[model samples]
Target: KIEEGKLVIWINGDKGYNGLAEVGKKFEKDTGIKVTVEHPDKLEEKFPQVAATGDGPDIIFWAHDRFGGYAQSGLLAEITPDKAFQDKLYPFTWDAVRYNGKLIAYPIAVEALSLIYNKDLLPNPPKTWEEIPALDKELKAKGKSALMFNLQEPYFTWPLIAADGGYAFKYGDIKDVGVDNAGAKAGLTFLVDLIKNKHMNADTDYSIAEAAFNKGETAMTINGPWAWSNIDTSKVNYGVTVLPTFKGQPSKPFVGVLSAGINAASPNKELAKEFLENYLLTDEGLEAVNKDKPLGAVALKSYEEELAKDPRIAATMENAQKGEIMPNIPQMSAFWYAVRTAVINAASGRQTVDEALKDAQTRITK
Candidate 1:
């Protein structure tokens, strides 16, 4: 069934280009199968068309979110990862690769939200939600907020809300939506109270929160590595740590991943799998990628020790382990609107936490 002598990989961005190119060199020498990595424009728009005719790249690198739809459309090859390789990856990374219980991709880079505090304002990060009030009181006197984030965004609120067992849908089964469950109510109540007590601004959004944090008007914020550039330019003395515990449970953020998958139509499917498993998953292979792009977190657990040299990256990896993979199903569209409205409604006192969530649950299930 091998119809080609080489393997082609398409990645949209330049971050992994040089590194995968480096791995491609080793791959050619080892198996005599030439590997070509290309950064193509409009990959998301063009992939489905070329793939239907078997003329697309043998492998494609993209965010895990797209893989679910790809697999559903039968454009991706199912790959049961080798146990040895699977064991080396964080368990949650696998969550994003599977669609309808079939494995379709290999997780490469990962990211999650963590507590990034202004070190000048608070020398040490709080360990639990209970401790935040004391810091809130202290910061209030200085005309600063204790914590600020996109108050209505589910992506930012999930960690805080899910600390009590809230979820939009269980990873595997979208049928049993749990947005109105008891635990979700508890978590939402916590946020509602924060707004009620004026500890946080109910209207705060991503831009507003970032501006406050950057201008040193807020003592702490929850964000991922993507925000580092803006924060760095502001020169706020900051420290990153895993999100504080809520009640007796750890805050669980949603993990986002970048992964690679093989085209089902590729004649070199087997070769692509072998290349990914033997070459790209190795320490050297990952190190090259890390060197070029500086991944905030890698799928390989061993590489995390090296990533620890940077506290921000280290805390991100640590928080990812405590988190759940972002749900990749189409139904997630419903969850987003429902949850955001619920949070805003509850925070504004238009509805009680229970009523807002109960309405949200109905909308999602309807």
Candidate 2:
């Protein structure tokens, strides 16, 4: 029962232009709710600023885990969907938006990292970290590099660490599990071994890895499906596999679920909920979104067979079977900065792995 005026919403700039644009238009045409979307590249900056002044959009499309920071800061509204609404979502999708004991957002899609490699080179990618170095040694003997890694960023390090039973933060209860943890230490050592033993080139950027693979300069690299189309698969056959495991345990990646949250201070709370229920959360609404994005779907009931035909996306669902939803703790924000610094320090020879871990632990725990 919204007044017959416009409803302004905000979405991330990257996906906003094409993806959200279509959804907004359709929503307006179907419901007469005149949906206007504001896409800002610096959502991380604008969201807080707007929210602080009670001038943020009525609805926001953002990552689920990111909302935890806003929730813990008392900046977001707690949304409790009726069982009918809740029953329509996937369990993981539902779980991701629920922080502590309350639902804070509505999930739109699930994203995770996996091993995208040149199938021509390895044909079969390694199933464990132990195999990576050996493959590197074999490649080096033939005067070639085996793999590429972004040693400067934690994005690459996280999978390796998780594979080795290491975690950036403790699960269940919030705790700091940094480089000092035995699993974390083992994971770091493995990464360092890859660098020192010449199995992985630490300096290779993502583009360089794809280019080198296309040129046959390297065998494999770890990345997600976003890079799939850009890769020159014609020159080099490519395939994807679940990230390797550690000690027989699957390498659990942080599942990044894209979702929308209602603004705590929005004047049109009920209107927003109606919009979500009628247009955003419904199967028809989800299908409209998937038509534009085509990566994945949020509503499980709307996950049609046609959507699963894409090989790359199918692989993502497979990987997600073993994935852990990225933690939605407020401390995760501070923890990321500290963890990234420690990773950079350790990766570069600035400090021993133990020293880097201890420093990160202190920063997070304090």
Candidate 3:
């Protein structure tokens, strides 16, 4: 039961704040607990400062990457829901919301990039990266873009790097990064080939890629659930699938989790917990979030079972199960810019793929 009349939470200015806030309206009327959600400007910089001063919200909805630091700083309330409550979650979802083996947040949504294909153009999509270009040859179509995505951005590019065995850090070793690992070179080589063959260029951005697939110019794209809305349903019949593998290993995408956590400084900790567990994390709440705003895969197994009726979520969950959680360490920041620049340089032929990756390693390590 709600022990308070009101609650205030912070959400970054994304689908969460815009989407979940609408659902909070019914939360107020039904339970008599008023919910206040806001997306304050400069959330990254401002949220920490404001929250640390004991002026923070009762709850905050954000990504899992920050939970570690917040756990260390005493910014979040310890929330170990019962074993029964945890049983509802996917293993990765449970792991995502944990901090140093403690539950610090509520897993709301899980996301990773997947292969969104124009089914009409290629009924049999490529199962492996090696088959991508080969299958492009099979299409006697208007446009020859077998696959398209932004090469300069690491978010989409990371799946390829990971497929080749590259990683920002060695698994479980937060301090070590492999921006120039052998796996990285293998990954960058394939991307360079993609650019050289004109399947896509370093300049091909999100809008271009989205427009290309919707306009029937590209047969497939590696994108996320976020791209579903921009698609013109009338113009295309699309399907979501795991990112194709480079070898026999699965293409391991970085799983980014968005979740809710109780503020350590809040006077209404129990109330916040009540609001989150009893209401926001439910299947009804999950459905409202998807219907009201942009949504990714639901983190709960039971909800996902219900949601798997959509072929898209079925494909997304297949990839999610294979995903590696995104590391929240500070070095991961340096890894992004350094590797992104390296990918851009190598793909554009500004540097040999080997030199580009080595330079990225040097920069990240330095």
Candidate 4:
């Protein structure tokens, strides 16, 4: 709390303050600098305006998905990682925080989705798209459904769309809008078949899907590790694995990294850099960073070896390896809503699979 060489930071509302405060204490003890942390519910919205006036935080803590937009706007300082820094984390983690060709942020944590199945109902999870057809029939006769997910959520559908070569583009970046000719209709049709032929619900939302999976009404669901906390594991025998392949193509989920982005206008760039490298990015620090919840396979070199024995971390690592980084651009907002509506419209029978995906592509092009 001392005023000498103070460093201000803005964090997301739901982040672990205890872990951050502990690091802040170390920074203070080691450097005689005060670290101030604030929770701005709208950190992204407020940061640009405030930082432009030269009164912004030295650091901004958030998921790396927005790193592109902020960097493009000149709101963040470019923090390049050398070979030593880059070699410490998973290969994909380095790619997640890059904007254009430069490093936009220092990555800390990783999050991605995987296939979570109940062994009591499904002893063996499907390894390919072809296996689901027969499994669906068997499960239906046994008074259970083979698979379930929120048909309306865009994040959940990303695995299928990207697997079938669909893509969401940032504004003016025409190269990314590949759904038109990327063979995406195949994936959308696959999902429609599951809903129609297997009697899966088009109207099912997140809660209904989670409840169905937990109560043994469904044998499998694709979700993130966070969902594990909501489930009562003692009642169900479950396992987590990477999403199955689609028509022999990989189903890549969206991988997000928690990062420390710096404000370019701040005066304490050297201090900020030292604090991150010394206090937060070390092996012991990565474990301490996760105060409120357990993390998946992290980016640290030695610590990652320790977490490999945990099956859930193993599952997260597998999916992350096969995943794609979501381009952290402002246009992502439009992409999400368009995909959500298209998936729901196709599933609810308001549009054919071809019509739904085509319309989504047209909407994005505008």
Candidate 5:
């Protein structure tokens, strides 16, 4: 039923307000359904509290990982995409929203990590991890560091570790090897060596790295497209490329997808579905999204040409095709904190790389 009243939705306070407001107004004009968007400041705190009381917005924009908690608690609605939709969306985008056996979220956008470098510093960026150490040596001779990373954050470590053939969990059929698997251990060693010997700063936070790159103080960084707008390339030449490979295989980054999901408890479920089906999944909707926010699009087929022209965004999408979605499993929550501790311990010189990861695997598996 198309209600005469407004559809109230909640979104994160940062980055989404402008886009949501524009989309809401456009959706209202096209569908005659009044739409109102509210972005409370303390969304992270407020959403769970509201969900606890069975009082939350009709629609909420959230990461796929949170699906585990919400779905486990019976707070999320199970949605089955129509057969037509199943064939229309990209496989990876669809996979991010599907939990257990049901589709729980509608993907809006996807992101992955990439190597962002200063073209002025290095005419050619290194193509393999083996090249990094020598490059760091050369940069140090010139009184500059080759790279910086947030060793305390696992989000940033996954790509580097995975590039070295490390994995946080054994997936598919192999359950014996855990986070302390040889590849992961080697990845930790790679980071520790970079920090302790190559003079790469392990304490560089995202903000600090961004500032350094923008100021041309650092040669390269590992980050996503969200930082693209803030980087001033006018005074410095820069390029974005896929994260360098290890032994010829590129590092696998944890892909994050933004999705739109129906509120299971909404009175207008069918109406919302119809709107999403007709408007959001179509070429028009994709164009609107990509035009408003030109980084990238979830529908690869529709925006492949546009992305190809932009090396930075193109490399990210290219990397995404080979990347893995950040697991939506509830067990992931426990895994994250444990990994963080391992990273912190190694960076602080309190434990050997192997020892820190061994403890991380033990805690996560236990």
Candidate 6:
């Protein structure tokens, strides 16, 4: 009983849809099923509002982080990719697709923090955080900062904090908060010392640090491939590599996935599933999607060979495999707010590392 035979998908932003739209045309021609790709304003807020009332698009294309809450609200349909198709995706890509023992989304691409450095400034990037201070001193002689990042943001700080076993939440268990652990204290101490020792700018926020890097005032800044637009235009001759390890252990950054999921209440369920599994998940389909935005890391293994041709993407994928997936649970919002405040308090000298993290942990538990 098909109430509506056509398929509708809501996509965010301007870049990711062109290829999908182009492919949708082909899908329409092949299957005689009309495909409408719409870009609605305030998609994140709008999707839920309409979805609850059974008036949203058949599919929503967005990051996997939102899928957890969506699935919990019973707004998403379970997806079961065939074994043959599933095996062609990178092993780690599955991390974002499942929630509470059910597959909730199909991952398209990956993004994670990598050590993007100025090749002109440092021909050889350091392999460990311990080595950064010495390089700072050397770069200081030449009148430049060694490294700069938004020091208080957990998304940026997690690599250091988790270097020795710290985490926002342990294994998707929100109750197992580990932000104030010994390893977290050590990581916080290292970052604060860098500022106290004058190796990095304490006042550098995201935009400021990015500006410093783009202007060639800093030798390095940890960022994702999304920084390409600014850095490429700056002509800084940058190179991307795995993040430097801390205390002889690798730093684990938060990995995020861009994905697509079905709306459980959609009337065009079979058509939506058919379009996704047959047309969207195909090698040809993913290639078209990549052509527009040039995915930083493709979640599908078949597309890996093509994307890995770019050195930065290769390095990013390597770093991503070494990192942990960002938790998609609704509690993550509170975790972000609490942890950001705690890191700011600790790094700015308003509180001790222990005091700040303890407060953060307490706030998260509430």
| TM-score top scorer | 3
User: Each model's TM-score?
Assistant: 0.70, 0.81, 0.82, 0.76, 0.82, 0.80
Error (Å) of candidate 1 at residue 79 is 6.2
Candidate 3, clashing residue pairs? none
Please provide, for model 1 over 38-149, each residue's C-alpha lDDT reduced to its tens digit, 9 standing for 90 to 100: 8887685467678766668888887676677677778899986778879988897888788888888998878788898999988888888877877898877788878988
lDDT of 6 by residue, 16-108 (tens): 577788879889999998898888876866888888877788899876777888888899988878888788888777878788988888887
- TM-score of decoy 6: 0.80
Where in model 2 is the C-alpha error above 4 Å?
Answer: 1-17, 31-42, 137-145, 149-153, 175-179, 198-218, 225-237, 247-249, 268-271, 282-294, 304-314
lDDT of 3 by residue, 193-309 (tens): 877876567788767787778888889998776567656454588888877888776787877798788878777887787778777778877777776544677777777777768
Per-residue lDDT of candidate 4, residues 52-89 (tens digit): 66657898887787777778778788886678877887
| Model 1 score (lDDT) | 0.82
Model 4, runs deviating above 4 Å? 1-63, 80-92, 130-137, 140-143, 169-173, 203-208, 214-217, 229-235, 263-275, 289-291, 328-334
Ten residues in sequence with the least summed lDDT for candidate 1 = 288-297
Give the TM-score comparing model 5 with the true structure, all chains together: 0.82
- Assess each prediction's global lDDT (C-alpha) against the native: 0.82, 0.69, 0.76, 0.76, 0.69, 0.82
Model 2 — which ten-residue stretch has the worst lDDT?
12-21
Better of 3 and 5 by lDDT: 3
Pick out the ten consecutive residues of candidate 6 with the lowest summed lDDT.
287-296
Where model 6 places Cα greater than 4 Å from the true spot, the runs are 1-58, 61-63, 80-84, 151-153, 201-206, 265-275, 327-330, 348-350
- For model 2, residues 140-175, the per-residue Cα lDDT tens digits are 655666777456656567766666667756664575
Prediction 6 global C-alpha lDDT: 0.82
Whole-structure CA lDDT of model 2: 0.69
Alpha-carbon deviation at 45 in model 6, angstroms: 6.6
Local accuracy of candidate 5 as per-residue lDDT tens digits, 176-278: 4357876677777877877888466667776677777788777888876656655643466778887887767778887777666666567766656665666
